[model samples]
Target: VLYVGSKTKEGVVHGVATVAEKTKEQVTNVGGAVVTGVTAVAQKTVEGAGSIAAATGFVKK
Candidate 1:
């Protein structure tokens, strides 16, 4: 029947929407992790440079 066909189409559309939502969530999660990792690396690099300057008596008075 037409009703059954319409129901089936609705189910497929719902399933696709769910998958798209989850994909967006995964991308957001990964983007956040990458930003956090990059920020941490920058902080560590600055700290390392400061330590090196202090060790070599090159630190600004």
Candidate 2:
């Protein structure tokens, strides 16, 4: 999984760190600072999109 990890963090966080990182990082969520930064990051997003598809009737809600 470090391959994905390496790419994700090292991808946008490397070459474009100064500019791209600042954009992708802080702008993610203001609430993340309140919880486990790493936990809240991937957890909420996966739960959100799948549920949203049904709520919006996009996937047979």
Candidate 3:
């Protein structure tokens, strides 16, 4: 009986650890995606600014 109880406890702990690891991975993935989106938006904004400047002849191209 003691052995069975010990095994059960171990299984529960393993299950909890697995869940925690998966949660951490998902959070990291979301963080990376957010950074990617922000970077893309910043690049587009800079390019748009350049386009506006060129259109107004401010860049003198």
Task: List ranges where model 2 is wrong by over 4 Å.
Answer: 1-4, 8-49, 56-61
Model 2 lDDT per residue over 1-61, tens place: 3554453332122232222234454334542323222311122343444231221213433
Candidate 1 has which clashing residue pairs, if any? none
lDDT of 3 at 37: 17
lDDT of each: 0.27, 0.30, 0.27
- Every model: Cα RMSD to truth: 23.0, 12.8, 23.0
**lDDT score, residue 6, model 3?**
47
Q: Which residue ranges in model 3 land beyond 4 Å of their true spot?
A: 1-24, 28-37, 43-61
**CA error at residue 32 for candidate 2, angstroms:** 34
Clash list (residue pairs), candidate 3:
none
Worst 10 residues of 3 by lDDT: 34-43
- Model 1 ranges off by over 4 Å: 1-27, 30-32, 36-61
